[PDB]
């Protein structure tokens, strides 16, 4: 999946 934080995108596994 691809979550989002600090108005930014991140990648981590599913």
For 6, which DSSP code?
A: T
For 5, which DSSP code?
A: E
Token pair in block for residue 10:
């991140």
Report CA-CA distances (Å) from 8 to 11, 12, 13, 14: 10, 13, 17, 18
Q: How many whole angstroms separate alpha carbon 4 and alpha carbon 11?
A: 9
**Contact between residue 14 and residue 3 where contact means Cβ atoms under 8 Å apart:** no
Residue 9 CA, chain-centre distance (Å), reads 4
**Contact between residue 3 and residue 13 where contact means Cβ atoms under 8 Å apart:** no
Please list every residue in the chain followed by a chain break, i.e. its C lies more than 2.5 Å from the next written N: none
Q: How many whole angstroms separate alpha carbon 12 and alpha carbon 4?
A: 10
Question: What is the three-class DSSP state of 1?
Answer: coil
For 8, which DSSP code?
A: E
Solved using: NMR
Token pair in block for residue 5:
């934080």
């Amino acid at each position: 999946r691809v979550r989002t934080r600090k108005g930014r995108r991140i990648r981590i596994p599913p």
